[PDB]
Structures are given as C-alpha cells and as structure tokens.
Paper text:
The twisted pore was resolved at ~ 4 Å with local resolutions ranging from 3.4 to 9.1 Å. Compared with the flat pore, the twisted mPFN2 pore shows a non‐perfect helical conformation with an accumulated rise of the β‐strands by 63 Å. The conformations of mPFN2 subunits in the twisted pore are almost identical to those found in the flat pore (pairwise root mean square deviation (RMSD) = 0.085 to 1.204 Å), although the transmembrane β‐hairpins in the MACPF domain bend more towards the pore interior. The intersubunit hydrogen‐bonding register of the twisted pore remains unchanged (purple lines), indicating that the accumulated rise is caused by a mild twist of the β‐barrel rather than a shift in hydrogen bond register between adjacent subunits. The twisted form also shows a mismatch in the detergent belt, which corresponds to the position of the lipid bilayer with respect to a membrane‐inserted form of this oligomer.
Perforin‐2 (PFN2, [name]) is a key pore‐forming protein in mammalian innate immunity restricting intracellular bacteria proliferation. It forms a membrane‐bound pre‐pore complex that converts to a pore‐forming structure upon acidification; but its mechanism of conformational transition has been debated. PFN2 belongs to the membrane attack complex‐perforin (MACPF) family and shares structural homology with bacterial cholesterol‐dependent cytolysins (CDCs; Gilbert et al, 2013). Distinct from MAC and perforin‐1, PFN2 is a type I transmembrane protein that is expected to be cleaved from its transmembrane anchor during bacterial restriction, releasing from the host membrane an ectodomain consisting of the MACPF and membrane‐binding P2 domain (McCormack & Podack, 2015).
Author numbering:
A (entry chain F): 217 to 266
B (entry chain G): 67 to 116
The structure:
C-alpha cells in the first residue's frame, strides 16, 4: 500500500490605508472668523488564496 | 460435470476439463486532485468636509 499527499496553500493580503486631514482656522478680533476642515480616508483590502 | 468438480476453496463448480489457479490479486488506485481558489477585495472610502 502506498499513499502520496501533496498539499500547497498560498495566501496573499494587501491592505493600504490613506488618511488626509487638512484644517484651516482664521479668527480676527471678533469680526471675521472662518474655520474649515476636510478629512479623506480610503482603505483598500485585497486577499488572494490558493 | 460428471464428477461435479469443485474449486478448492469451495466457491464455484468447475467442469472436469478445466483447472483453476487462485491468483487472487486486487489492485486499487485512487487519485484525488483538489484545486481551491479564494479572492476577496474590500475597499472603503470615507470623505469628510466640515
């Protein structure tokens, strides 16, 4: 009796996250006041199994 | 089948004009091939403007 078992498993994972925050605030002597902010978050995940 | 000749192990009747050699040989061959593939892609984009 003979038995031969060959098993090959492969996994790849790539996760890329980018976060950009830009804020600007100007405050004069209680006459002009402007505050703005922008947030951009992008997360991408890719998995490959064999 | 005048003499009702029987095989030595007693499992079949052979006629007088024949003789059996018990070459009881079994050959089994089982082959199994399994290919599996898994792919998952996840993207999440979040944008905030205040």
């Amino acid at each position: 009796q003979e038995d031969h078992v060959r098993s090959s498993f492969l996994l790849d994972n790539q996760n890329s996250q980018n976060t950009v925050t830009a804020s600007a605030g100007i405050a004069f002597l209680n006459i002009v006041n402007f505050k703005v902010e922008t947030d951009y978050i992008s997360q991408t995940s890719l998995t490959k199994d064999y | 089948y005048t003499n009702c000749k029987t095989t030595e192990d007693g499992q079949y009747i052979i006629p007088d004009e024949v003789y059996t050699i018990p070459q009881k040989e079994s050959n089994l061959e089982m082959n199994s091939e399994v290919l599996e593939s898994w792919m998952n892609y996840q993207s999440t984009t979040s944008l905030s403007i205040n």
